[PDB]
Symmetry: D3
Subunit: 247 residues, 6 copies
Amino acid sequence: TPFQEYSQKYENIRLERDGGVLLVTVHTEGKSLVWTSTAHDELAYCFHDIACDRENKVVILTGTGPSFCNEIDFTSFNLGTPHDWDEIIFEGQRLLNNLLSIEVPVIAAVNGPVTNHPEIPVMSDIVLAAESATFQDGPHFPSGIVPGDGAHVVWPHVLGSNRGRYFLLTGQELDARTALDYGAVNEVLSEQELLPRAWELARGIAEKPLLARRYARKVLTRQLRRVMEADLSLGLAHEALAAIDLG
Amino acid sequence: ATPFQEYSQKYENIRLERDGGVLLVTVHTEGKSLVWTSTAHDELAYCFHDIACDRENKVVILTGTGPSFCNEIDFTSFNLGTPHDWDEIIFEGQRLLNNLLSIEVPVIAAVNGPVTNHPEIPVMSDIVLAAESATFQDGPHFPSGIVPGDGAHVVWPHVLGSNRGRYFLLTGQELDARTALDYGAVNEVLSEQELLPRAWELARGIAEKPLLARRYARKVLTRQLRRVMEADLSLGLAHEALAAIDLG
Amino acid sequence: LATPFQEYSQKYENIRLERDGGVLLVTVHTEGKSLVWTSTAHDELAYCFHDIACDRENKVVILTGTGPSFCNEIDFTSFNLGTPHDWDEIIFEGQRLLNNLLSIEVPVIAAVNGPVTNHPEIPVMSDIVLAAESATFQDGPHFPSGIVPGDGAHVVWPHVLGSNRGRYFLLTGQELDARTALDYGAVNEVLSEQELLPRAWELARGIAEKPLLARRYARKVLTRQLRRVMEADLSLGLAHEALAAIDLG
Amino acid sequence: LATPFQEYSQKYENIRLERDGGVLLVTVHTEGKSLVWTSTAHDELAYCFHDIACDRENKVVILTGTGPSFCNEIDFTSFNLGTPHDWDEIIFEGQRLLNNLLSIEVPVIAAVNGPVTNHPEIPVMSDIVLAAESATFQDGPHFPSGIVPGDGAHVVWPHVLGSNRGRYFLLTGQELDARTALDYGAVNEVLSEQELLPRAWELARGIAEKPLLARRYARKVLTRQLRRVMEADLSLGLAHEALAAIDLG
Amino acid sequence: TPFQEYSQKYENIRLERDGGVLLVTVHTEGKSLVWTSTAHDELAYCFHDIACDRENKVVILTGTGPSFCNEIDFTSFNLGTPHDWDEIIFEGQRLLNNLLSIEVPVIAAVNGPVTNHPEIPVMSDIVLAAESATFQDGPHFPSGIVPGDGAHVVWPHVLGSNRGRYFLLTGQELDARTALDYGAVNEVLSEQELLPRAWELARGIAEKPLLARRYARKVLTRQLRRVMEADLSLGLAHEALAAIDLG
Amino acid sequence: LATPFQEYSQKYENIRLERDGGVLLVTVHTEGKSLVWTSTAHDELAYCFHDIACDRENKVVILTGTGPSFCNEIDFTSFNLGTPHDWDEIIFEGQRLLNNLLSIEVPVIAAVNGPVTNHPEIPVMSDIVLAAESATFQDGPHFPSGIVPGDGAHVVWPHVLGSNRGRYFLLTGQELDARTALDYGAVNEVLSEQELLPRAWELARGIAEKPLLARRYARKVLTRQLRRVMEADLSLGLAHEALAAIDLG
Ligand code: NA
Ligand code: NA
């Protein structure tokens, strides 16, 4: 399906493309994204659309306003039965598997705090953070929920073994410069410079030969793909069991 | 299945005290800093098995006592000369680290001071706390003419990264507390006085979480270490044994 | 029978090989100045690593360069990059370059005397990495040049720098200076130019004085994961690099 | 929102899609005759497998052909095989074809109604494989035709036949008849032409009666190793296939 | 724990040793084993005791009476909640991982039908079967239960991809000669010849040098151990979720 | 830099090497009679597989023996098996033997002319396995002689026979005749004594007619999983075999 169709399918995702550089901006009515079942499932479907559309040369992922995503509407999720958890398991797999199936480089521009699926931006090939960006996993273990949704794969992968486990268990908040030092972020920029820097990088990548661009991505995500396939759905099933047990 | 009342008292080098589901494991020799021996080695393998099988452990703290975690060894306690003798070390060495990984609750290390004997054990924990005086060093392997094949070869490159881990194992580098912190092997550096109180504080917090959340967090976090340990540990041990036997 | 040191030490116009008390010093050069990367040098290193690996009298290896750069110049006219024919020779010898490097069964110490832009992954594949204050690492010949980083750069850099530092390094043409490489953990020690080789020799002598099987098996037990990821991903990388590059013509 | 069945069931000129009691019958064809493999059919199957995977009202899938052959003719003129960027369309969609198939999370039954020589690995990736007496399996369009079997053939056939039978099948153009495929363990049941689809329906109805999550998670727990090796090896094979094919002009 | 402690510990497992060959006979009051949660957990602990006892040179695993194990006391299991299923998951992991931790060769002598954990005998290094032996997975998919307890790992591993998946979906019964042809079984014997043959092969193994016996087992179980670590707990969590959904 | 066929073809006393139209016939022998396994022969085969792999004019390989047996005699006095020193040489060359074989990048055909009891895994690692009616396979020199089968036997036999058949074969000293090996899928064709070499040549000539890159890449995509398990498990096996053997003293 062509850009003109899918670019307007998503209430929580603005999609704008210029010169084959796709800017994907998550949002709730134009304010910082409030995480919902709807935003979750839209991102999974949107990632699929982006991946299937060859005219996307490079992807920039960002939020809007003061936060990337640090608010949630728990009333929007059904977390009580195996029935409802299989819906979450199935689209949770597609969320991260569709992200990794995108075959062009992905740049994150983290504009502010993220506490819901904070692993998504740090799965990108280039990670840029505003001075105010932070990363934190409060909705999992600090809230009595298994970090089994990809968090358990990605954070030890990107922070290393012990920083990753500690981050996940203690609710540590990583600010922009700590994330930079831990190697999860590549550049810290003022808020005003963040998106211009993403576009500059993206344009440079977009100028490279078609197949060079596409294959850079493919050769660079091999190990992440292997560990996601190994551990993601095991995490999700365990997180589901633990969550159902609360009732 | 062995009850806490029995196993808590069966280990001469491991004090085992539980309060509100938090198990404090203190390694020691006659109430001073642990002297590494064949007996301590095997006791820890069996003890980790017992801990793993006891579901009333909600969270574990591993610590030492006195000025050192474990930086002295009694080499005369080990039979290192024949394959027969190495097979018992290989078998219990696999059990030492696999039984540790079979523990299905979060594990916190509180490293009270220098560790040179199996220093990989504390850094395999989910949370790593260190005293200011804590140090890590693999002197008993390559600096002493012995292959670091007992798990040191899996864990140090896993936790420090490829180049730091290989260098650490080949040069006898001593990591002080703040270098280990910067390298990401340690999470917090505390004064000696603050170390255990902080370990307790983190442990009590974890222990409050729901039963399956606590358990499955540990399970979902240790996948990659378990894969690499299964892939590489036995290979390391057999090679270390071959090389050691050659020495005589 | 194996090729004896007396033979292979004199086989390679771009690789000097000096053995002193079992410590083998491998110095890459172009007529006694800093190595200029060529097809010849590429293939020589692949064959040389095999000869080194098969010679058990090498107790420890030090890899270094000469002059102000380790290798940051190239002779573009020495390669043929236009046809699948051209590329199968690069694929085949490129696989042999890194696999033969990894087949060396003693510890390898790198002493990075200056900038490296051509196969900079080679030094950082070493068990001990020492760098002069002036050393740098950069991957300009790949992506900043419109070429896929699939010749092993895609394996080694994310492995040694970590996932995000590695991918960023490969996509943006980032130059790592010595102290940044040290902080990122790709380098173990930064030394003055005058102290670099002396330190390499010091560490190398210390390893060479360990018992025979101990040193031989240390390398083997320490390179398992790198060997696993190289076997999984190297050829995939090279074939994709080859396709992308042929497409340009 | 997912594409509804009422829409996607009519979108594919080479794939008939009929559903009853949650059993989805997927019949591949060309103008109602036995399927002729083309670029169109190849990509349609990739898209269709994605649509089937995303529609959770598919409780079980039966995959089958029509007429004397499952698919034993190919129109090579429908593909562009001469340049890298044309091969990237095939690499991309080729990956989707097999990965989308594996992303289907209900059990898949193949009903092989006669000879298959093009993508014969598709039906044998199924969880249950039924064959008519006249079914055969052969990989002639790859190696016997001077083309690398790198499109998934190299993964699936060694995986389902075993190492040596798989390699031999792919290098010699061996044709497996139904009873041989049965004995090799690629086929589970050989039926007369009249009993084939009735048996597929019998088995599908049985599966469809099982509880929702049991049915879904059965597929998932059973395809782990196949998924591992496809991820590890598919793209490698495709790039190598492309390089070799391009060199051919 | 030496043999004289654990040899009498298990109500459903008789243990006898002759020339260091351990014969493990599963039974219920001296009749064919009736599967229960007790028998399940006793096997798991027993396999640990066997693995840790270096005076076991070789192991023979068999049943008694007409069946190896084709009856069950469905009332003995608690399959209603996640925390009840964590019991089964934890111990199901131990059952198969403790089996694989045994570091001497294991011979199965399948005396008749097995339908409850039939994967156990075929995990052995040598599999001998009486003419009357059969193998079938009725209790999983034919009963609306996910075959995720290790069935999913072992049967595709031993039968091959397609025979394995088919066996697990259709409730196919493999008779002894089919199991032989499929490679799950090495020898089919008359009932009267089965145990003598097991003893003969075990004694032949026992004659080899200590470390040769032990290391033969260790180098031969590498691949099974790898797939079991990759996939077992994934299967058990999903089986648990699907089973809880049943009420 | 690669040794040309003119040099290496005459370098091995136990390996006759002849090439016609790019088909390389590798015949193992002791003084023109059936090969007797020795340290010399083991080390020669390792060196020879490296020469074969590096020589691109080899389009396809036939591996065979001479006389009534492929290799069913051994000279145990030619091996040093007492010390860790002795065994590290065996480990090192045992790794090179199987890894050099797998480094060969063209299809390999085995023509097994009779019984093989020494390193029987070698022929069954081939892409096509042909057996005379008199061929047999057996691993008597390992476990039936009180030695761990840790030299690659432990990898290859479960890989090619399946899990239970592989383990049984290695523990019991089972002898597989030609028809059982065929049924088990280790062998692809059983031929009469007179038809074995004619058939191998016929298949080799057909493969050699294929396009250059397709031939070369066919091998590479077909040996992925064997390479992965060999890397995972070979050295572990050898070290444990060494430990057990040394203990025998
Ligand atoms: Na750092
Ligand atoms: Na068969």
